[PDB]
């Protein structure tokens, strides 16, 4: 995007990624552009995850942000599925009903984007054993550890959320990148222009 460059974050090649403190525009935008490019180039598919169904109420507008980036490609949403040039390229999944979505096929997913993954902030209304649910989703659609990644985004910066607690991640807020063996926490300073 214009102000957020996911290149460095992606270069870490971690299976699990958390980008937080994300101030509105680029992070979410960038993570629409990246998987779309992976499909067009390599046929890699992607899953867009939100916690609850109402968060996907307007998923028909998903490609509007990035439509101008791919003018010569037909970007289509039908229900909760994403199509590029007439081919199934991705899925929108409410994590709350992942168990029901498992009956479907997911041939070549390599990127998962979980936007607004922190219950922000008003109440810890997370799904029971939610981390296990995302984990199950990941193992289901990722064939192996090579060149796959789940990227979780939030405008919040609750350093004590179920995912950080579950995986024993306690980042240093003075660092843009807190690095772990299988996980990464990025706190972008993209919109501090000073």
Describe the structure.
The chain is α/β, with parallel strands linked by helices. The protein has one domain. Helix content is 23%, strand content 23%. It contains 5 helices and 9 strands, in the order H-E-H-E-E-E-E-H-E-H-E-H-E-E. Strands 3-4-5-2-6-7-1-9-8 form a 9-stranded mixed β-sheet, covered by helices on one side. The longest helix has 17 residues. The two termini are 19 Å apart. The relative contact order is 0.24. The PDB classes it as viral protein. The entry lists the keywords ASCE fold, viral protein. It forms a monomeric assembly. Crystal Structure of the N-terminal domain of the DNA packaging ATPase from bacteriophage phi29. The protein: Encapsidation protein.
